[PDB]
Amino acid sequence: MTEVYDLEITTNATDFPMEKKYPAGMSLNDLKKKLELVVGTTVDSMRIQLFDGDDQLKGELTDGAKSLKDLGVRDGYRIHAVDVTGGNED
């Protein structure tokens, strides 16, 4: 009934991958707000990159107007957040 997807979260600021399951029926804006809470970053300054379950990077999400399910984020995916305000990306 409720759709939930399991993720491995990475960030540029953190060097610790976090595995957690989240509701796919919710917006990206919530997911990233969850991330914003941990990293301390804000919405525009925090960029979300999606790595597929296979290996490759699919693209950038950035759309939280849809549901994570509609975005096809799915489970077993790795969500990489990057803080852009501090300039860190490498």
3-state helix, strand, coil in the chain (%, to 5): 15, 35, 50
Experimental technique behind these coordinates = NMR
The amino acid sitting at 14 is: T
- What are the start-end ranges of the H helices in 1-90? 28-39
Residue-range domain boundaries for the chain: 1-90
CB 15 within 8 A of CB 56: no
Rg over CA atoms, the chain: 12
Nearest to 48 by CA among 20, 7, 4: 7
- Residue 59 zone, left/alpha/beta (φ > 0; ψ -120 to 50; rest): left
Class of domain 1-90: alpha beta
What is d(CA 64, CA 28) in angstroms, rounded to the nearest whole number? Answer: 4
Q: Report the C-alpha gap between 87 and 85 in whole angstroms.
A: 5
